[PDB]
Every structure is written in C-alpha cells, then in structure tokens.
Amino acid sequence: MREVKLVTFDVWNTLLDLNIMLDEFSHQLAKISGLHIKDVANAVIEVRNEIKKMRAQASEDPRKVLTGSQEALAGKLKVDVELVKRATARAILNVDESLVLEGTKEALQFVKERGLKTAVIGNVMFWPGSYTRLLLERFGLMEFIDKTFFADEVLSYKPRKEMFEKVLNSFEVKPEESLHIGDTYAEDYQGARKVGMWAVWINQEGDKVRKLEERGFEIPSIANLKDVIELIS
C-alpha cells in the first residue's frame, strides 16, 4: 500500500481536555452575566448537543460555524453575545497546562521524528480557532504541528469533504497517504474515512487497538497512535 506521509490531529479530547475548558467557560460566562452557573452550564450542553447533531449531517451553515454557537448561547441565556465573547477570552486566560492530555506531546514527537508531516484539523464552537491556537502555542504543542486548520478560518467543519481535502491539498498528498485521528466518530472518523484517508477514532471506553474496517481503527488513547502508524508502515 501507499506510505503515510501526513498525520492530522483533532484538538478537543484528542490533544486537549475539553471538559476543563468548557467548565472554565461556563463558569466565566456565569460570572460576568450574573446568572446561576447551572443555567449557564445547561445552556452550553444544549447548544453543543444541537450543533453536534447538525454537523454530523453537515446541516450547519459553515459561515456560522462560530457565530451560530455564540448567538444560540446568548439567546438561551438572554444576554448580549458580547458577554459570550468576553467569557471565552477570560476562560482562555484562566486555563493552564492541566489541559494537556497524557501522552499528547509524545505522540506528536513520534510522528515528527519519523519524518512525517503534521496538521491540526479542528472544528470550533463558542471560541474562535485563534483562541485554541493560542493554547497549542502556549503549551509547546505547536513545535510539533506543521499546519493548523480551524473551521472558522477555513469556513468548513468535519465531517465535510472540503474540510479534509483542503488540508490534503495544502500538503500536496493523497488521501491514502494520510491518517486522521479524532475522538468524535461522526466528525473525525467518518469524515476522514469517506474522503479516503486512514481514520483512527479515539474511544476511551476501549481496551485495545482495533481494526474497525478497511482504513479504520479505534484506539483507547493517543498513546496508541504509534502502534497504528507502525502497523501500516
């Protein structure tokens, strides 16, 4: 088979811890809005469930990949969307290194040491891709990332076809010469799989590396990415 030249990474729940970030955000939004933390925490889950359900079917207008979530949240809580934007800014300044998931920097180093190209393909919600890029840069991860592709900056989102192809084209590689790893089945796995790339789904509820189908695997943690990479090299 063709040799893998590019490994692409999802961010939330693959490299960084999403719940800590979402909790810091709910907290910060509740603080500046003077609202009860439970109402804010619930609104966040509702907006996230809704958009996740839409994105799986490519039903959200990519032009609102960011603004949509922000305005939906603002409306649920009856506040100016300006407060939502400010809350994300404060949350990004309040989180820290505890956000980095175990084995993350090691897996990135493994890829870069084999001479492979790396990239980040992440969707966005509530806060722009620029905020997430700030975190990657701040935790030293960007040292191992060659290119970053955030939904709001590319005007698309996983599992949409043009989102992955944009990345493949940027590195001038073919789908079969690429592998994408992410934790959202409907977004990362199916997205990369139907474009032709090798796909790896992180299922923390899993125990071992499993071949799910042709060009598709399931692994318990990013720590096992090196096993999949080595298996197909």
Next chain:
Amino acid sequence: MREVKLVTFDVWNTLLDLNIMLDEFSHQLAKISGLHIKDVANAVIEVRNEIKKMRAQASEDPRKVLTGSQEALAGKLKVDVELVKRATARAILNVDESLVLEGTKEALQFVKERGLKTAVIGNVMFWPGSYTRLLLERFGLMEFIDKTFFADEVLSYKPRKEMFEKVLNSFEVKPEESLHIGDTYAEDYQGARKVGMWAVWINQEGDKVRKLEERGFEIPSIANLKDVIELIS
C-alpha cells in the same frame, strides 16, 4: 445641541500601544522564521501602508483583510503563512500591561461613571479582532466597554460610513449623540465626522485640547477626552 449618549473608541494608539505590539510581533515573527527583525519590520511596514491606502480608496474587502495582511506578509518574507499566525499567538503571549496607554483606564472609567454607553470600533490587520479583545479583557479594560465592532467580525472598516452606522444602529442613537475618538486622521476622525458624530483626533505631537472645527477636536492623548466630554455637555 443634543446630549452625547455614546462614546466610541479606536483601539491601537488610543487605548493600547501599537508600537510595542508591532515590535513584539516582528520580534516573534523574525524569531520563528530565522530572519532578522529588520527584514520583518520592513515587511510589516510595507503591508501596513499598502493596507492603509486601500482603505483610503474605500476599495478593501472587509472579509479578506486579515488573511490578506497575513498572506501579504508571508509572501514578502517567503515564509509559510502558518509562521505568521504562530507569531501573533506568541506575541499576544509575550506582551503585558505596559501595552495600556497612560490614562486609558481612568478615561474609560470617567465615561462610564458619567453614565454613557461605550464601544470599540477598530480595524484589523495581522492578528484577528479576537486577539485584540483578549488583551483588552486581560488588562481590565473590557469592564468599561459595552460592545465591540471589529472589521474582521462585523465585515466593514473605518473610514467607511456603514461601519460607524452599524454602531449607531446598534446603540440606536443619532450621530449627534455620539463621539468617536481615534488616532488616525483619515480613518477615525474624517470617518466619524462625515457620519455626523462628534470626532476627536488623538494627536500625540499635540500640545493642548484644540477645537479643529464644527464637531471636530484634537487632543494629545485619551487623558483629555473628559475635557471635550464636559465641554459639549
């Protein structure tokens, strides 16, 4: 004369020091690129001026401004546009409160305690409007700003008439009940005045508060904003 209900604010060189930022940015960009700061500073200057001119020509695309400035800089230096994006994240991480211009907090506080609404109206270049919002938030200034209207988010730019009108329609006030202060004569001053608002041009080389004309003022720094405010009240 109608009483002023809204005071709008330019950001760079009005509230925050743009020299310090551009310098931190040029240093970070030169650092990750392996180029001399001089090379980078010149490219920044060249892009900065060429963009200013296009705005004077009212022939700039509000939706491409940010990416344009980054692609223009990346091309002048012959680097991947990714290094430009990383540099803005790194600069934002390496700057501090020394970025706040003297008297900014007091000036903002004076306007707020006066019971007036406030807003930020700024153009974007090199780093997204969101990074600018992050710093204002980080330095405690967003506490005195009710709304933000950035070119990359609102899809318009000063001195264009629609940019100022968006803010007027947002706060639902007449041009005569608004005062805009900024340090760029063509973008801030002439743009605000042609729309009918009170306009204050910050001129550092200035020595005292000066009435430039009907609804037009010139002051050396934001520390004298209150003088104009109380003057027309």
